[PDB]
Amino acid sequence: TPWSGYLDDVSAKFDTGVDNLQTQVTEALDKLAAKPSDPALLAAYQSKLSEYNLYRNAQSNTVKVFKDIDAAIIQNFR
Amino acid sequence: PWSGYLDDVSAKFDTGVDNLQTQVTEALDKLAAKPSDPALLAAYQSKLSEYNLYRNAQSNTVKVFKDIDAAIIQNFR
Amino acid sequence: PWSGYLDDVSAKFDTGVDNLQTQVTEALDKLAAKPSDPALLAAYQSKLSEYNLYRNAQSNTVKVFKDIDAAIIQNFR
């Protein structure tokens, strides 16, 4: 089995937090190549893309800050 | 059945947009049936402006949460 | 040859842009064949709008997928 640290633990916590966000974005892109002017399609596109953007930014910032605490506390060993 | 906060906001707008989109067609076909009056043209114009302004409100109410949450992420450290 | 996660996203819309170029070129040609109707002018605005919408949507896709990980690589440390 692949390993997972606390950083990987929180990253996986976000990844399992969003159920089908990646697939939803991909299918929004796929349908946006066919019927783009559709309101119920284009609005959902932009909404879910913004949600995906914030999800990725939250993942990166959370893992970076947790690495920051880890580095700061580990610097105090010596 | 996922619907995040941005999707939650869009939910309050999709049901309004659908009604306007269904009634603008009912205005257009009526106008095509009897275009001899200007009152029906004004009604169709008002319905179209209704649809487009509500759509624009939906368009802007999402980019205004975009930067709020982005600024939260910037100070999220 | 090589194609990253942005090249394929751009090419996803390329299947419709070529179609719409062909269609708009035929629209101009048939307008030149006979211009005495507003139906063709209306179709012209219907099609140029779809063109601008495809192009702007593709630009938005590539921009947002640039910014999705520009920030992640900014704090890549």
Binding site: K35, S37, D38, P39, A40, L41 | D18, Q21, T22, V24, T25, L28, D29, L31, A32, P35 | D37, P38, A39, A42, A43, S46, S49, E50
Partner: peptide, 19 residues
């Protein structure tokens, strides 16, 4: 329920009254 078809109906009804 989409917008390409409403553009199509506009481009069609602008001619449906021409003749």
């Amino acid at each position: 329920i989409s917008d390409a078809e409403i553009w199509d109906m506009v481009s069609q009804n602008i001619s449906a009254i021409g003749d």
